Structure formats: C-alpha cells, structure tokens
Design a protein around this ligand. Structure first.
Ligand SMILES: Nc1n[nH]c2ccc(-c3ccccc3)cc12
Length: 292
C-alpha cells in the first residue's frame, strides 16, 4: 500500500509554511536511505489535541475525496504508535504558493496568465461545491503553483461539509478568522456557503490583479477604509458597517473593466445575487478567448 507512509523514512528538507492549525514541510520519502526517494509535502498539527486531531482527520478525508486538476493531490497518511498522531502526505508543487510566486514575478505575469489562474481556481472551487464542501479560506496563500501553466487549491484546513438539508454551515465558536476575505453574513452570523466562497473568490481576484502589493492588500485597504485606529473586535464592527454601506476594495490599477465587474458582482450584499462558480468559469474562459 503506497498510501501508507512510515515516518522514520521521511527526511526533512525544508519548511513550506504554516496553514492555520498545521505546518507543512517538504520531505523526501526515502525508505532506501540513499536520497533517491520521492519529494513530498507533509502536513502535521502544531498542537495535536483531541479536538484538533478530530478536525485534522476530517480534513484528510475531505482531501482524499477530491480528484481534480486544480486541487492538490492526496498521497497518503502517517500514523504514530500510541496516541495516534496524523500526518497528511501530499504531492509537492515546486513553484510554491501563488501569493509568493506573484509577489516575486509581479507584472511579468501578464493578464493572460492571471486569467488562466483565475479559471483554474474557479474550476477547482466549482468541483469542490459539487461535493457540498465549503472552503471558508480561499486566498492566494492557499493556492499553489505546479508550473507556469497550472495552479491548484492547496489547503483545506477550514473546509466544512454542508448538512444534508442546509445550504449554509454555521460556526458556533469561531477561531482565527480571515475576516478581510469574509462575506458580510459570515461576519455577522458566522454563516458559510458556496456564496460566501464566491465572495472570497472576488477577493482572490483582487489579490491577483494587485500583484500582492503590500499597501494594496485587502487587510491594508479595509483598515484604511475603517480607520487604522480600529483595534480587535472593533475592526469587525466597523468592517460590518463598511460593507453594509457598500464600502468595497477599489479597482486595482490597470485592471480590465470586465475583470473588475466580476469582482464587484462577487461582492454582493445579496447572497443569492452572487454569480455561480459554473458561470464564473464560463465568463473567465470567454474573456481569455476574446484576448486570444
Ligand atoms: N509546495 C507545496 N506542495 N504541496 C503543498 C501542500 C501544502 C502547502 C501549504 C499549504 C498551506 C500553508 C503552507 C503550505 C504547500 C505545498
């Protein structure tokens, strides 16, 4: 069974970053101990408590159930003897996160390339929604670059399955929340749906067309709009009030009008009025086609 990975054969190579409750490391799976084994990405929990272990195991099952070109590939799991610590083994994508990639190359990644990525992100999200999963954490830091032509959604640490008879998931005790990517109803009511994922996708699109410029980041811009003096819980209060009054991120400099229109449609206060991922993928592909 190639999906069974023995821990003692995993050699640390380097850190790939922190993903909320876990950390990711590039490791070589080297059972021959001759440095010829496959390089893989290993996700593990920083604090592997009961509750966290339970959530991590659901995360692993979620990822194992997804097979798509634009979703990072599940490879297997590590089990520890005794207390049953879990490690998630995934394919290694060597160009790193889209956030770092775009921050590095900036405008050398042209609009044609940005829209190819948008389309791939859209397709990965559409497929996710057909499984009734809600991502809840869609941001360029959670998207990975395989090569110049392909990106994949790379982390599913906050992903939840919808109840059979509901079209939203409600979070009763929120943890660390990426509030600057949140839809209004997620801020006010902790309600998460395909439509709040679409809102966050609008924010991802904004990130892409600002080329991850620090002064233009969603946190920087929303803080500017509510006032940099706002702190802690008051940030959430003022953000809710800003969004209610149609305060929005500005059009990135140089952004095509058709692309900006997509963002603004995703950021609808009316949940039902937001576009679908199926339609967004059709629209982006048409725009790419017009440009080519
Ligand atoms: N470079 C990668 N190849 N495969 C991966 C799987 C997960 C993450 C990751 C996700 C969130 C935070 C940090 C790293 C990174 C990679």
């Amino acid at each position: 069974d190639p999906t069974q990975f023995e821990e003692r054969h995993l050699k640390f190579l380097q850190q790939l970053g922190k993903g909320n409750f876990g950390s990711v490391e590039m490791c070589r799976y080297d059972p021959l101990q001759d440095n010829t084994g496959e390089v893989v990405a290993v996700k593990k929990l920083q604090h592997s408590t009961e509750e966290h272990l339970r959530d991590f195991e659901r995360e692993i099952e979620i990822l194992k159930s997804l097979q798509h070109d634009n979703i990072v590939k599940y490879k297997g799991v590590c089990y520890s003897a005794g207390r049953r610590n879990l490690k998630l083994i995934m394919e290694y994508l060597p160009y790193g996160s889209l956030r770092d990639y775009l921050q590095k190359h900036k405008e050398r990644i042209d609009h044609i390339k940005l829209l190819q990525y948008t389309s791939q992100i859209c397709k990965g999200m559409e497929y996710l929604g057909t499984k009734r999963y809600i991502h809840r954490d869609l941001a360029t830091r959670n998207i990975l670059v395989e090569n110049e032509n392909r990106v994949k959604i790379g982390d599913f640490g906050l992903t939840k399955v919808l109840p059979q008879d509901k079209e939203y998931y409600k979070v009763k005790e929120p943890g660390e929340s990426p509030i600057f990517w949140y839809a209004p109803e997620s801020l006010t009511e902790s309600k998460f749906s395909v439509a709040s994922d679409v809102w966050s996708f609008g924010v991802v699109l904004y990130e892409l067309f600002t080329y991850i410029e620090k002064s233009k980041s969603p946190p920087a811009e929303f803080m500017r709009m509510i006032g940099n003096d706002k702190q802690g819980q008051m940030i959430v209060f003022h953000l809710i009030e800003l969004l209610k009054n149609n305060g929005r991120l500005p059009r990135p400099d140089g952004c095509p009008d058709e692309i900006y229109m997509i963002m603004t449609e995703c950021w609808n206060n009316n949940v039902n009025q937001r576009p679908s991922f199926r339609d967004l993928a059709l629209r982006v592909d048409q725009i790419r086609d017009n440009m080519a």
